[PDB]
Amino acid sequence: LKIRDAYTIVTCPGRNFVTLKIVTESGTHGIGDATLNGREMAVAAYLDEHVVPALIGRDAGRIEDTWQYLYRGAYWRRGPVTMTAIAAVDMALWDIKAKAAGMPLYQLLGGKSRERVMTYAHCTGQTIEDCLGEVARHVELGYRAVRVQSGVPGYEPADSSLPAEHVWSTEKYLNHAPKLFAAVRERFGDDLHVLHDVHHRLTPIEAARLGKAVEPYHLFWLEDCVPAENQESLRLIREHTTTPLAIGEVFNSIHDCRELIQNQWIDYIRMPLTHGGGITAMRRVADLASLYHVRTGFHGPTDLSPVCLGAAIHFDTWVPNFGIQEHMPHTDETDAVFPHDYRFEDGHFLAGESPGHGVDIDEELAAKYPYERASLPVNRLEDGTLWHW
């Protein structure tokens, strides 16, 4: 499987996606997601200028050696641009390997551990009542799990060419959030899995406060409570609440969460394939997690392409310690650019049976949607302080 060609495709069927494609001598090809929301062209350049030329002539069957070659060989290790490029290669190589094996990817990984992949939907509204209306609608679609967000008194996040500036007040939020969860439980009961994303805005003692306040609502998870570059940040939360915790969509390395996991400070690891060094790296993450009862909860936003979603569904299908799969539906244009054989049914994903990860890119269609810059917002406190979005 000597690599004849490799290149990136950049497209915007409703939002930006970057994709690496690798083509071997026998015409066997694989694609990997390389999308990094708000910083897309950095990964495209990292790939186009520095990785791509090095892939020509390599044996595409050597997945592990290529991963170490790119990770160690970069000299500068880890990081979002770095690991997303590496994940793109890794994802494409596993795609090729599965095709060469004549197997859908989940079979290659060790076979299926489950007959379907539970997901959760996004239920958002300006008021509690709107959110509740959303919960109803998604329950009717078959979803067993919902992420609930509402407005605090007093959707594509990367919504502006340059970062939009939002205002934040922690105390208003804390005083309001438990009210949402109580109303969700009042209307829908305890059968429903209910998730909330705190989205980095709290200090640990504040997140401890919240966690304790929402214990009577039995959240499936409380996600991204606090910025966690300092992993010890989760300690105070964990020591003060039994509300399950989730973190890691902003992580790109097992070194970002090793201590979180070993200390049992989280219940679910959120780092996905595209940002976490791909299949090769994520297997090691899931394995470590399994030693401590920690389960996978893959980030699955619009800003990871169907290539990642397809591969993630295969991964979800095999991995023993599967928790849940996030599902923010891509636009119809996006789905058309990325033909795939995974399917959604009654609140769950079903892995494809086609060899590879089951996803392709229609390059002719993708060319109809040129890149359009879009940045993630910033968050400021009411005094102007640049805060966490």
Ligand X SMILES: O=C(O)[C@@H](O)[C@@H](O)[C@H](O)[C@H](O)CO
Binding interface with ligand X (CB under 6 A) = 37, 75, 157, 197, 199, 249, 301, 303, 326, 376
Smallest gap from Cβ 252 to Cl ion, in A, equals 8
Asked if 82 and 46 touch (Cβ cutoff 8 Å), the reply is yes
301 binds, among Cl ion, a second copy, ligand X, none (CB under 5 to 8 A by kind): ligand X
Strand order in the sheet with 17-24: 3-11, 17-24, 29-33
Work out whether 164 is an interface residue with a second copy (CB under 8 A).
Answer: no
Examine the residue annotation and report whether 50 is marked as an active-site residue of this protein: no
Work out whether 81 is an interface residue with Cl ion (CB under 5 A).
Answer: yes
303 binds, among Cl ion, ligand X, a second copy, none (CB under 5 to 8 A by kind): ligand X
Pairing outcome for strands 193-197 and 145-150: parallel
Cα torsion 298, 123, 220, 38: sign: positive
Q: Which of 5, 59, 77, 101 binds a second copy (CB under 8 A)?
A: 77
Of 176, 193, 199, 240, the active-site residue reads 199
Q: In angstroms, what CA-CA distances link 365 with 29, 360, 362?
A: 18, 12, 5
Helix H or strand E segment including 221: strand 221-223
Tokens, residue 98: 């599965």
What is the residue type of 159? Answer: D
Smallest gap from Cβ 197 to ligand X, in A, equals 5
65 binds, among Cl ion, a second copy, ligand X, none (CB under 5 to 8 A by kind): a second copy
61 binds, among Cl ion, a second copy, ligand X, none (CB under 5 to 8 A by kind): none
- The answer to whether 326 is a known ligand-binding residue is yes
Q: Which stretch binds a second copy (CB under 8 A): 135-143, 189-197, 211-219, 369-377?
A: 369-377
Residue with tokens 């599965």: 98
Q: Total residues at the site for a second copy (CB under 8 A)?
A: 51
Pairing outcome for strands 268-269 and 245-247: parallel
- Which residue, 97 or 275, is less far from Cl ion as judged by CB? 275
Q: Which of 73, 79, 111, 133 binds Cl ion (CB under 5 A)?
A: 79
CA distance 190 to 184: 9
Q: Which of 2, 26, 53, 381 binds a second copy (CB under 8 A)?
A: 53
Q: Which residue is nearest to Mg ion (CB)?
A: 197
Work out whether 82 is an interface residue with Cl ion (CB under 5 A).
Answer: yes
* Gap sites in the chain (C to N > 2.5 Å), preceding residue numbers: 154
Rg (CA), the chain: 20
276 CB-near residues (< 8 Å, 6+ apart): 83, 87, 251, 252, 253, 254, 282, 285
- Which residue, 106 or 349, is less far from ligand X as judged by CB? 349
Asked if 115 and 92 touch (Cβ cutoff 8 Å), the reply is no
Tokens, residue 152: 């605090």
Compose the 119-158 pattern: x for residues touching a second copy by CB under 8 A, - for all others.
Answer: ----------------------------------------
Smallest gap from Cβ 30 to a second copy, in A, equals 20
In the annotated binding site for Mg(2+), the residues are 197, 223, 249
In the annotated binding site for substrate, the residues are 37, 122, 249, 270, 299, 303, 326
What residues are labeled active site?
Answer: 199
